[PDB]
Amino acid sequence: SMLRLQKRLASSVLRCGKKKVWLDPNETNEIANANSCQQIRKLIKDGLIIRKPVTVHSRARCQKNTLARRKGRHMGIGKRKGTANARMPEKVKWMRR
Amino acid sequence: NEVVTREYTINIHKRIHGVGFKKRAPRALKEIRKFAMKEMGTPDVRIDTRLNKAVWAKGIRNVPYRIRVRLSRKRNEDEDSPNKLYTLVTYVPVTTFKNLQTVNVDE
Amino acid sequence: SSHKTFRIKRFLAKKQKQNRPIPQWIWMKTGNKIRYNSKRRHWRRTKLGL
RNA sequence: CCGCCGCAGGUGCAGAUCUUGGUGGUAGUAGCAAAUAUUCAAACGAGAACUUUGAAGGCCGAAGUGGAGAAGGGUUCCAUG
RNA sequence: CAUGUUGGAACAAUGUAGGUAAGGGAAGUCGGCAAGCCGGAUCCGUAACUUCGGGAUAAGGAUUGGCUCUAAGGGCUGGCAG
RNA sequence: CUGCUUCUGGGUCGGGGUUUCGUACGUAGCAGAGCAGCUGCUGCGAUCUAUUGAAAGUCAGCCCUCGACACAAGGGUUUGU
């Protein structure tokens, strides 16, 4: 009916965002009468309130692309947005030499 | 006679033609609800969470052209609305709509 | 603000305690004229000076 | 409270873009159009487009619609109803 | 976070904010206003004039994707190997 | 402006017709710049060729159906010389 107190507390106890607090929608009325963090820590042990997993940001196509960059692919004349100096400066080239 | 379940493909594409990008999927839910009221004369049309998901799968703008649907008139649960029966509109995954008739699936 | 002087926090203390409605036995007194507390003060509406 | 004889005056309103208060027609009208977007199911409840939970689709996109503060507010905090 | 203090239904005219237009091309207009063109990077090339600093991204060209290669540019350790 | 049982009628889906786009995924190839390995085979590889005028969409205000599927002899408000 209103679990805002118990989603806020659950977020504070899990040390996550209330984004990631899953309250069992079946056992709502047993979550409803929590009212304290100690009472909510029981519902974490009972597995009624659960930390949702992190929404996946895979950088697999990033690696696949960086492997092509290592071989000089996608690094052609019509993929260069900054100046030759801007990209790799002549002062750092000289320092190295 | 009353607890009847029938398969349907709903040409959403010709029930969505000319509605704006940010109202295509919301409209697609409202013609599947009309489609239920029309074929099984029940104001109480409850549309499954998985059929919602199926319409919204391509996002708000792009909607499945055809969606397969199991349309099931059922005896209403307690705390009664004066509607004696309701229709539960359930999604059916399908790979080809090519030569799919409306089938009277049985209990 | 969070940083206050003791003098202002005593001023703000009095203004809180004045901001309660009349007791429901005050209007049962013989020569009662008070219907409700007219000198109530909400924190959006009237800004208490300073 | 008033008639008669006298006495006295802050003594008669349609106006002053008069003063104060009230009420019309306008009119159920203008309007409730800046910043992309909602949807499905359930729960509580007399009652749900808006509340809460779950699920979907989106947005801010670390110079944030994020997390903290100073000025300023002053209890707005928190629970319950 | 719930679209900015409301939803629902239509998709007329007039708006407001976006676009696109055959052939012509500023004939429009006080006036190219508005819009459009132009744009990054690499390689060329660059005038009058000049306080010799500039002008200068002057103007004017070329190239640009994806893919498979090739060459060049280094550390570490006992003209060399690892 | 139309339609709502002449055993008939619209409606939903399907299937053809039309048409738009330009040849789907998968599989196959001693097609493929070349490259890597293993003693010719095997890989990695944009693209190419066949399957394939393929695939996909097509009335929502295209045309035709006699193929499926339910639905349809109702409801409401009035009207007299």
Q: Which residue carries 């295509």 as its tokens?
A: B24
By C1' distance from the Cα of B7, the closest nucleotide is F69
Whether B48 CB is under 7 Å from strand F: no
Look at residues B29, B50, B36 and name the one whose alpha carbon lies nearest to residue B83.
Answer: B36
Type of residue found at A44? I
Partners of B66 in the β-ladder: B11
Would you list which residues of A are annotated within the binding site?
Answer: 86
Supply B15's token pair. 């029930």
Whether A52 CB is under 7 Å from strand E: no
Whether B99 CB is under 7 Å from strand F: yes
Look at residues B77, B75, B55, B79 and name the one whose alpha carbon lies nearest to residue B67.
Answer: B55
Q: Which residues from 46-85 of A have any strand D atom under 7 Å from their CB?
A: 52
Would you list which residues of A are annotated within the binding site for Mg(2+)?
Answer: 86
Whether A4 CB is under 7 Å from strand D: yes
Supply B98's token pair. 């090519």
Those chains having 3 or more beta-carbon pairs within 8 angstroms of chain A are none
Whether B22 CB is under 7 Å from strand E: no
B8 with B71: CB under 8 angstroms?
Answer: yes
CA C41 to chain centroid: 6
Ramachandran area for residue A83 (φ above 0: left; ψ -120 to 50: alpha; else beta): beta
What's the CA B52/C1' E78 distance, rounded, in angstroms? Answer: 73
Look at residues B40, B43, B42, B32 and name the one whose alpha carbon lies nearest to residue B10.
Answer: B32
Strand D positions with any atom < 7 Å from protein CB? 36-44, 48, 51-58, 69-76, 78-80
DSSP-assigned states of every residue in B28-69: HHHHHHHHHHHHS--S-EEE-HHHHHHHSTTTTT---SEEEE
Q: What is the DSSP letter of C19?
A: S
Between CA B37 and CA B45 the distance in angstroms is 7
Resolution in Å, one decimal, please.
3.1
Those chains having 3 or more beta-carbon pairs within 8 angstroms of chain B are none
* Angle ∠(B66,B68,B72) on CA atoms, nearest 5: 140
By C1' distance from the Cα of C48, the closest nucleotide is D74
B102 CB-near residues (< 8 Å, 6+ apart): B6, B7, B8, B9
Between CA B7 and CA A46 the distance in angstroms is 41
- The SS3 assignment for C44 reads coil
B39 with B7: CB under 8 angstroms?
Answer: no
Whether B1 CB is under 7 Å from strand F: no
Exposed, middle or buried: residue B9 (CB in 10 Å: 0-12, 13-18, 19+)?
A: middle
CA B48 to chain centroid: 9
Residue C48 CB: number of other CB atoms within 10 A?
Answer: 10
Residue A22 CB: number of other CB atoms within 10 A?
Answer: 15
B23 with B61: CB under 8 angstroms?
Answer: no
Exp. method: cryo-EM
Whether C25 CB is under 7 Å from strand D: no
Element (H, E) at C17: helix C6-18
What's the CA B96/C1' F11 distance, rounded, in angstroms? Answer: 24
A43 with A34: CB under 8 angstroms?
Answer: yes
Between CA B90 and CA B68 the distance in angstroms is 9
Between CA A48 and CA A40 the distance in angstroms is 9
